[PDB]
Design an enzyme around this catalytic site. Structure first.
Site, PDB file in Angstrom:
ATOM      1  N   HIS A  61     -45.113  19.444   3.992  1.00  0.00           N
ATOM      2  CA  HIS A  61     -44.847  20.069   2.926  1.00  0.00           C
ATOM      3  C   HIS A  61     -44.773  21.784   3.232  1.00  0.00           C
ATOM      4  O   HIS A  61     -44.324  22.568   2.515  1.00  0.00           O
ATOM      5  CB  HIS A  61     -45.913  20.205   1.614  1.00  0.00           C
ATOM      6  N   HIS A  91     -51.607  29.147   4.526  1.00  0.00           N
ATOM      7  CA  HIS A  91     -50.225  28.364   4.749  1.00  0.00           C
ATOM      8  C   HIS A  91     -49.187  29.376   4.088  1.00  0.00           C
ATOM      9  O   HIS A  91     -49.470  30.301   3.337  1.00  0.00           O
ATOM     10  CB  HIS A  91     -50.000  26.928   4.098  1.00  0.00           C
ATOM     11  N   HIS A  93     -45.290  29.783   2.029  1.00  0.00           N
ATOM     12  CA  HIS A  93     -44.161  29.304   1.438  1.00  0.00           C
ATOM     13  C   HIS A  93     -42.897  29.937   1.729  1.00  0.00           C
ATOM     14  O   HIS A  93     -42.995  31.225   1.845  1.00  0.00           O
ATOM     15  CB  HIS A  93     -44.165  29.017  -0.246  1.00  0.00           C
ATOM     16  N   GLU A 103     -43.334  32.446  -4.026  1.00  0.00           N
ATOM     17  CA  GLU A 103     -43.671  31.700  -5.362  1.00  0.00           C
ATOM     18  C   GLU A 103     -44.128  32.580  -6.437  1.00  0.00           C
ATOM     19  O   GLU A 103     -43.110  32.449  -7.531  1.00  0.00           O
ATOM     20  CB  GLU A 103     -44.938  30.904  -5.066  1.00  0.00           C
ATOM     21  N   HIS A 116     -50.581  31.976   1.690  1.00  0.00           N
ATOM     22  CA  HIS A 116     -51.733  31.992   0.968  1.00  0.00           C
ATOM     23  C   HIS A 116     -52.868  31.685   1.742  1.00  0.00           C
ATOM     24  O   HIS A 116     -52.904  30.723   2.476  1.00  0.00           O
ATOM     25  CB  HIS A 116     -51.403  30.529   0.159  1.00  0.00           C
ATOM     26  N   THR A 195     -50.309  25.757  -6.615  1.00  0.00           N
ATOM     27  CA  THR A 195     -48.970  25.555  -6.686  1.00  0.00           C
ATOM     28  C   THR A 195     -48.147  24.390  -6.130  1.00  0.00           C
ATOM     29  O   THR A 195     -47.154  24.290  -6.385  1.00  0.00           O
ATOM     30  CB  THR A 195     -48.302  26.811  -6.269  1.00  0.00           C
TER      31      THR A 195
HETATM   32  C1  LIG Z   1     -54.858  23.946  -0.515  1.00  0.00           C
HETATM   33  C2  LIG Z   1     -53.936  24.509  -1.751  1.00  0.00           C
HETATM   34  C3  LIG Z   1     -53.144  23.703  -2.421  1.00  0.00           C
HETATM   35  C4  LIG Z   1     -52.197  24.539  -3.387  1.00  0.00           C
HETATM   36  O1  LIG Z   1     -51.332  23.931  -3.998  1.00  0.00           O
HETATM   37  N1  LIG Z   1     -52.234  25.868  -3.683  1.00  0.00           N
HETATM   38  S1  LIG Z   1     -53.275  26.644  -2.849  1.00  0.00           S
HETATM   39  O2  LIG Z   1     -52.666  27.820  -2.374  1.00  0.00           O
HETATM   40  O3  LIG Z   1     -54.226  26.752  -3.622  1.00  0.00           O
HETATM   41  O4  LIG Z   1     -53.928  25.975  -1.519  1.00  0.00           O
HETATM   42 ZN   LIG Z   2     -49.307  27.805  -1.164  1.00  0.00          ZN
END
Ligand SMILES: CC1=CC(=O)NS(=O)(=O)O1
Ligand SMILES: [Zn+2]
Ligand SMILES: CC1=CC(=O)NS(=O)(=O)O1
Ligand SMILES: CC1=CC(=O)NS(=O)(=O)O1
Ligand SMILES: CC1=CC(=O)NS(=O)(=O)O1
Ligand SMILES: CC1=CC(=O)NS(=O)(=O)O1
Ligand SMILES: CC1=CC(=O)NS(=O)(=O)O1
Length: 257
Positions: A61, A91, A93, A103, A116, A195
């Site tokens: 993902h 990570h 997006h 996002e 993030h 998210t």
């Molecule tokens: C692990 C994690 C999962 C997610 O969906 N959003 S987040 O940015 O809080 O990081």
């Molecule tokens: Zn994220």
């Protein structure tokens, strides 16, 4: 299983994860004129000097850069937060095109990508417990725009060929996440959610006002990643972003006038 395609993307997630239509879902559009300046919001405290990066993983993902979160080595405090939140991973997006990928949006504008930095509240003892609590996570969100290269990002970009497909990981020690921060720590904050599924409503969102700039070459290399595993048909890992969700009964607060 959920993803970002036409048949398993964000518009389908509510069927397996009904909280997708919940009261504090993320991301949201940040309407800059409607955000309320709160002079009582404290400055953010980002303490990353002792951070221990470990590994980078393509999870199908996105890719996660993972940190040692078994001690208070890299912590976020202050701002809207009570207590101490430990960095567990970061990570991104991103889009298939420079015009989209983030996002959160700012006055409906989509950035090329969004970083993030994920932290969990130490009072709950680990990440799995934290995600079950309304104040369990604090995520620092940082917008990426395309312009000059971000030097502190290049070590990430350069390793992506080693984690091209889902399930691949690579050693990623001695990476300094301070190299991903903008100059200013001015921020907006609101209560939200993960998210991605399971979309749990456990996140205090802290979105920095100032984007970082990355080069076209850097983001192009993100777009060479694959959603699929090795030996499966190639599907480029692009547009792995959830669109803005209704703000509902929430007010976004700003740390700055
Ligand atoms: C692990 C994690 C999962 C997610 O969906 N959003 S987040 O940015 O809080 O990081
Ligand atoms: Zn994220
Ligand atoms: C576009 C797309 C995105 C995704 O998340 N999974 S998929 O590889 O089935 O197709
Ligand atoms: C207003 C707006 C709408 C959109 O979808 N993408 S964008 O970045 O061009 O900004
Ligand atoms: C993801 C990845 C990025 C890159 O830079 N080269 S590659 O196409 O081998 O794989
Ligand atoms: C550890 C893991 C489990 C979870 O609850 N959310 S997540 O899918 O972002 O990552
Ligand atoms: C992957 C690729 C190979 C290379 O050698 N230089 S580059 O950074 O332009 O892109």
């Amino acid at each position: 299983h959920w993803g970002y395609g036409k048949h398993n993307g964000p518009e389908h997630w509510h069927k397996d994860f009904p909280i997708a239509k919940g009261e504090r879902q993320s991301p949201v559009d940040i309407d800059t004129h409607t955000a309320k300046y709160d002079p009582s919001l404290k400055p953010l405290s980002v303490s990353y000097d002792q951070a221990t990066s470990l590994r980078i993983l393509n999870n199908g993902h996105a890719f996660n850069v993972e940190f040692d979160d078994s001690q208070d080595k890299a912590v976020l405090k202050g701002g809207p937060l009570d207590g101490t939140y430990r960095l567990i991973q970061f990570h991104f997006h991103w889009g298939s095109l420079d015009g989209q990928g983030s996002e959160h949006t700012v006055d409906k504008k989509k950035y090329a990508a969004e970083l993030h930095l994920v932290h969990w509240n130490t009072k709950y003892g680990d990440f799995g417990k934290a995600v079950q609590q309304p104040d369990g996570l604090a995520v620092l969100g940082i917008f990426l725009k395309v312009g000059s290269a971000k030097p502190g990002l290049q070590k990430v970009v350069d390793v992506l060929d080693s984690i091209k497909t889902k399930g691949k990981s690579a050693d990623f020690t001695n990476f300094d996440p301070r190299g991903l921060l903008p100059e200013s720590l001015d921020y907006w904050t609101y209560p939200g959610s993960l998210t991605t599924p399971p979309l749990l409503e456990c996140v205090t969102w802290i979105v920095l006002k100032e984007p970082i700039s990355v080069s076209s070459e850097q983001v192009l290399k993100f777009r060479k990643l694959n959603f699929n595993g090795e030996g499966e048909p190639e599907e480029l890992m692009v547009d792995n972003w959830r669109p803005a969700q209704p703000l509902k009964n929430r007010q976004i607060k700003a740390s700055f006038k």
